Assembly symmetry: C2
């Protein structure tokens, strides 16, 4: 509402791909990974989400507060689609966007900060996490 305060209040920590996060849930059912995981995720002016992909699970991004976000998706690593993740339903925005399994993804706040939630069905696992080489962009 003031970012810094949100990071403290929720206990957000630097995420490997950039930004700050905190895992709030890992279903105890559905194997060690669990049926799904949930996370609070936040990006600030500058500090953004670098290209990465969850190799074996779908991730649904949810807008919660702050400026909207520009979410880029590239399933084959060549062509990319840009989504505006926000609540302004009548302004071409959508507060919920589905990232298919193994689909490249990156994002950045279009303002001071954006607080989001991320749901990964087959529970998120870093052993299914891969980041693109820095400076890389679909096509490279």
């Amino acid at each position: 509402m003031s970012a810094q305060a949100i990071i403290r209040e929720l206990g957000l920590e630097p995420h490997p791909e950039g930004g700050f996060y905190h895992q709030t849930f890992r279903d105890k059912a559905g194997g060690e990974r669990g049926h799904s995981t949930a996370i609070y995720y936040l990006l600030e002016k500058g500090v953004r989400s670098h290209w990465h992909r969850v190799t074996d699970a779908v991730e649904v991004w949810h807008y919660y507060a702050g400026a909207p976000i520009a979410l880029h998706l590239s399933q084959d690593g060549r062509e990319v689609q840009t989504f505006t993740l926000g609540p302004a339903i009548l302004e071409g925005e959508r507060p919920q966007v589905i990232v298919p399994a193994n689909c490249w993804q990156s994002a950045e706040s279009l303002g001071d900060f954006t607080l989001v939630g991320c749901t990964v069905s087959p529970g998120f696992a870093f052993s299914s996490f891969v980041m693109a080489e820095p400076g890389w962009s679909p096509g490279d």
Copy 2:
């Protein structure tokens, strides 16, 4: 500063079956009777939108030319829907080019007074490959 009526008049636009005004500007003599591809000038104004429809056997690409941005809605299977803001504000979640895959449901609306766009249908547009949803209908 232009007006929709000045554009409609200057480009020789006529009302399109899906709503809005349009004019076919090209059909390739190569590639059969449908042509390797077709191009079109298309315009929406505040109020008058583009109703849900799909091109069954060809990919359509939208191109922003002038006016306010547009909200382009895509639904491949008729349930999942994605929304892209078609426009020139590339640093704010906008893209002046968006690819509607073949046989995918699509609808759009201008976010201001008007939006002049271009549409290129590769396999070659043909009303024999044009289908609209029943009015009022929406994916789901």
